[PDB]
Symmetry: none
Subunit: 171 residues, 4 copies
Amino acid sequence: EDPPACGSIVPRREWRALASECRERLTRPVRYVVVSHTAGSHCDTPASCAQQAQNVQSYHVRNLGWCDVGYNFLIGEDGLVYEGRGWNIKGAHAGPTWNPISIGISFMGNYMNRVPPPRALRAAQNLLACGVALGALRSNYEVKGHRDVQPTLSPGDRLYEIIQTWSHYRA
Amino acid sequence: EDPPACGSIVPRREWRALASECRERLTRPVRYVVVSHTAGSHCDTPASCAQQAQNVQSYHVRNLGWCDVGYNFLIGEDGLVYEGRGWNIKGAHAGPTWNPISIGISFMGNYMNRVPPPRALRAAQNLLACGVALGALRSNYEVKGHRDVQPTLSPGDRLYEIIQTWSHYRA
Amino acid sequence: EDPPACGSIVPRREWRALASECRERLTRPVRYVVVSHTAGSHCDTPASCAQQAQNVQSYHVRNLGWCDVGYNFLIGEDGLVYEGRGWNIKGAHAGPTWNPISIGISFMGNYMNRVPPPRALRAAQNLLACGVALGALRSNYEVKGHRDVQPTLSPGDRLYEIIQTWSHYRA
Amino acid sequence: EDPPACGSIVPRREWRALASECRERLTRPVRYVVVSHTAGSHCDTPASCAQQAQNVQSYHVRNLGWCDVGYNFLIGEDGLVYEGRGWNIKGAHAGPTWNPISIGISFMGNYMNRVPPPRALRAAQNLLACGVALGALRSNYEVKGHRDVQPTLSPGDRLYEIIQTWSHYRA
Ligand SMILES: CCCCCCC/C=C/CCCCCC(=O)O[C@H](COC(=O)CCCCCC)CO[C@H]1O[C@H](CO)[C@@H](O)[C@H](O[C@@H]2O[C@H](C)[C@H](N)[C@H](O)[C@H]2NC(C)=O)[C@H]1O
């Protein structure tokens, strides 16, 4: 019934992100969502996750030389979502074919033999519903696992197994 | 005008590869080589390695819908090099910025907690030496680990540790 | 295969096409689409365009000796798509290398100094979407300029600039 | 900024439409499609037809005081479809009972003693199929004539007998 009717996100300033230099935009409404995992260590507190988001971005910006952390959003096990490039900026998370047409959300950690806590799954699914309500994502958007569009084990066997059951999943 | 027959490479026909639909070419001499691992199961016999190469290609062609296996060459633990897209066709292994200026060689297996056997490493260095002798690679080519140009664990912790010591490795 | 017959295409019979003698088939689904221009006269009415398509086929058949108009489909400035050899038959528009693995669509007119009207651009893009829907083209098909696969001016500088901005365009 | 709309519909702005002031919405997917003729002048080219859509709109807006042209979509004899109120906005073409539950498509011209060209009929069929793909029309919708729901000879005797032969028509 009123404008800002969706999910909470930790803003860039809050997790002390380096300023983005990316300018290429995505065309909303976006149809695809690609779920990946950072494949590294997980975090489970606002404190550790903010730090983890800073490290992921550092690697992408410092080492890979990218304009900003590749993901549009990051999901910490603290149950919070971390603002990446956002709903309107093209990400670098699934290749030249899917980057310009999807939203890349990455779960912080490695989920090959471990599943994310319920609160992390709720945060991600709450975020997608937020993207629909805002008009950032199509009402009939499609969820893919990173390994469905790129050769990689991401988002991890256990997590990949989870998203396959999701309402919007379409391999 | 010197022609060296230093190719102990297993032809696509020999490992029963599906025909390639790729047509884009690489401009020789190529300056970079990006080393990755398939992060899948490894193989130590010509027979099992031809089969694993088939699987890797099947994943890329049938699941990802690609023209061919993304790597220019694959390295088996059987100590043999398996022909991928070859020296002249641009591969799909390190992104839009690196694919067109590099040769991607991938070790079949996951090297986070395993090192490839000496014979696999010998195969890879001999393959790169052969590339220089043919004119396909610059004599002063630079080797990069996959994780140095893209966010990923590839080529695995132990293998990455090994290639960082290589003469041609560059930050 | 899939219920929806897609897009509005002017049937061969409607533009008074000479019967085709072509028999070689394409392998479904097709990966490539080569965009060309006829470099001939443009037409902006259903009548003038049915005539020009007849003229193009006439030149190809009667003067070049081809089994039919070499293009799989023709686009008119009248905003309609004119059926050539169709989705299932191999055309003659990009040479011995590409003809066997691509769909050739051609805009009727010379676009070195002119751009095709928006209706022609929309007709071309919906035809392709239709090809994908029909299973004739791969979901991840790639669009190429005629100049990218053969040494030619086709499809003309102005049109070439436009197809480069297309989502499925790959240099 | 991505690929354009299906059915190759000439956008409002392309046929130089006055801005719409309508707000009442239909709840897609819609169950009915009512076919009428404008009983106005006919046109057979993109230029003439854009002018006629302007004429029809001008009459409904300037003279009848409507928020926009009554029809959701207009079909020209040039074989193109012209965007009227579109898929989401309730039209004014079949009265208070039928306007809120149907999509109204109108053939530009008088068809009492004339049949519209095959392409105009194809554009109409193509428009309806693209409505389902978009999710605006019920995958299994129903088609009615103007005289089947209102006391009028619209869409004309000739055009009326043709739509009766359609596969989605309902008594
Ligand atoms: C200039 C012309 C180049 C093309 C010449 C080759 C002709 C035909 C090749 C096969 C087609 C590939 C392009 C279209 C495409 O299917 O995209 C891929 C997405 O999967 C799917 O659709 C799955 C369909 C299922 C969904 C059903 C609707 C990946 O995206 C890929 O696109 C490019 C080429 O493959 C690569 O540069 C890119 O590089 C890299 O390649 C490496 C695998 C690397 N590890 C990286 O992952 C990638 N780069 C980045 C930055 O992520 C790669 O991931």
